[PDB]
C-alpha cells in the first residue's frame, strides 16, 4: 500500500529504506523508531533527552499504543534558536510540547481527524480527508507510519499545548 501525507512521497525517495523509514521504524519502538527518521531525530533528541538532558519520553513513548504526531526538522526550525536554547534545559514546557506531539490510543489516518487527546492531556485537533492532512493547523507531511507499538505523524509545526 501507500502512506498518508505529501513528505510521505518524497520522504521515501530520500529515505526509501534504513531505519529511519516506514518499516525501518517500526521494527524499533516509536522512541528509536522516530530516533532515526531524519525528521524526529531533532524531535526525539527532546523527548528523548539529548536536547534537553532534564527530560525523557523515550522511555514513556515506547509504552502503550501511542501516536506521534512529530514536529518535523522544519517544525522546529521556524521556532527563534532562543526557543530551542531553551527546551535544552526547560523541563516542563518543553515536555509539554513533546507530550502534545504524542496520541494515547493509536488510530489510522482516517479517524485520527478531529479533535483528539495528545498524551500530554490537551487536545489535538487533527484534520484531513483524502490528499491532505493537517494537525493543530500543522501539516502532516508524513503519517501513518506506524512503529512498533505507536503510529507516526509528522507536521510541520512544532505543535503547543493550549493549556
Same mark, same amino acid.
Given at each position: 500500500g501507500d502512506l498518508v501525507g505529501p513528505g510521505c512521497a518524497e520522504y521515501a525517495a530520500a529515505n526509501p529504506t534504513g531505519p529511519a523509514s516506514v518499516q525501518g521504524m517500526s521494527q524499533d519502538p516509536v522512541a528509536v523508531a522516530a530516533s532515526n527518521n531524519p525528521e524526529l531525530t531533532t524531535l526525539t533528541a527532546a523527548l528523548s533527552g539529548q536536547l534537553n538532558?532534564?527530560?525523557?519520553?523515550?522511555? @514513556?513513548?515506547? +509504552?502503550?499504543?501511542?501516536?506521534?504526531?512529530?514536529?518535523?526538522?522544519?517544525?522546529?526550525?521556524?521556532?527563534?534558536?532562543?526557543?530551542?536554547?531553551?527546551?535544552? @534545559?526547560?523541563? +516542563?514546557?518543553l515536555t509539554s510540547i513533546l507530550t502534545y506531539h504524542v496520541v494515547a490510543g493509536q488510530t489510522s489516518p482516517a479517524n485520527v481527524v478531529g479533535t483528539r487527546q495528545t498524551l500530554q492531556g490537551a487536545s489535538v485537533t487533527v484534520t484531513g480527508q483524502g490528499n491532505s492532512l493537517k494537525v493543530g493547523n500543522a501539516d502532516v507531511v508524513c503519517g501513518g507510519v506506524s512503529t512498533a507499538n505507536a503510529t507516526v505523524y509528522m507536521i510541520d509545526s512544532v505543535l503547543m499545548p493550549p493549556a
Open positions: 538532558p532534564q527530560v525523557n519520553l523515550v522511555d @514513556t513513548l515506547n +509504552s502503550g499504543q501511542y501516536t506521534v504526531f512529530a514536529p518535523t526538522n522544519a517544525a522546529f526550525s521556524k521556532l527563534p534558536a532562543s526557543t530551542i536554547d531553551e527546551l535544552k @534545559t526547560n523541563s +516542563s514546557l
